[PDB]
Amino acid sequence: GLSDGEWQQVLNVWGKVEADIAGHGQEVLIRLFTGHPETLEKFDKFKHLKTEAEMKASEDLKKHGTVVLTALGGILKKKAAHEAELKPLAQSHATKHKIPIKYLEFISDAIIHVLHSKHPGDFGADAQGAMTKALEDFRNDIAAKYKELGFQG
Amino acid sequence: GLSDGEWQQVLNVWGKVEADIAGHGQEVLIRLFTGHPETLEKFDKFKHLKTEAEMKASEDLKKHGTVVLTALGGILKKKAAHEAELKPLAQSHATKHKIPIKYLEFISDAIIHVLHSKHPGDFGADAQGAMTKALEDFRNDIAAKYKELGFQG
């Protein structure tokens, strides 16, 4: 995992990518295609380009580079946002409060019960199965942080 | 992993919690502490509480319930938001484009190469490490989705 400061450095450099996304995206693809020509075969639109100059002249290759970097940027920013909330919680519950994963399962069962008790008409079998999976996914994400911290839990 | 529909059902029900977060949080904690008394022992501030009246009478237990549910709902929403961007990308790259994890490694390395190249002043060893990890974290996130979709990446 990244630390808090590492995620902030990822976000800072992506701000620089976005100030010239077309140039960055073009350069990334050319670098991939020249360094690893077998990749270029996946692109039915691009595989006729034989030289770096030909690649640089393609408005379509440039447009696809912008699509890739925009998609990646968005995923990185959403990961960073989730990590900035998950990491402080894992940190405190591993090192200060020393909470086993099993106890997070017990509280997840209590949440599911309270939601079902309070909102039966909004919390049928499908909704309940979805929430059970979301809280298991949450525990799994905390468990991965506990591991990085060496807390067995 | 949850499907998009499952994430939407989670966020739909969480809307109901938000309407009375403190009441939900009080009920969740009392359910937890009554079902699993060893969890109450982890709270130095609450472990003296012996009866349900005493637990309902506690100003701080109720405030803590709202803290806990507020923090979980923010993590769930941020996880859903990340999944809503990552899942479509993994689905197309697994099923339509059929891109191996190793090609995702090649593009990761191209991005780090181009960032190093176009920002000579800025992108030093630490920042480059942070991006390396962030792209491996991304490849790992895709690889987990690939598994779910039964695509060998």
Ligand code: HEM
């Ligand atoms: C950082 C990694 C990557 C990101 C963010 C990314 C993103 C995207 C996006 C947003 C699209 C258009 C929508 C879609 O079909 O999902 C796309 C299409 C595509 N991607 Fe990727 N991609 C990545 C890596 C790769 C790699 C390494 C390859 C091949 C070696 C690949 C091959 C393709 C192909 C063949 C298409 C369809 C192109 C077309 O005909 O229009 N991608 N990618």
Ligand code: HEM
């Ligand atoms: C859905 C799962 C949980 C969430 C979202 C959650 C969230 C929080 C929050 C936001 C705080 C205050 C900030 C902090 O210290 O990190 C906190 C404190 C605490 N949590 Fe949790 N928690 C969870 C589960 C548990 C469980 C299962 C236990 C124990 C059985 C636990 C024991 C504690 C303790 C002892 C504190 C310090 C409380 C104080 O004295 O004020 N947590 N938790």
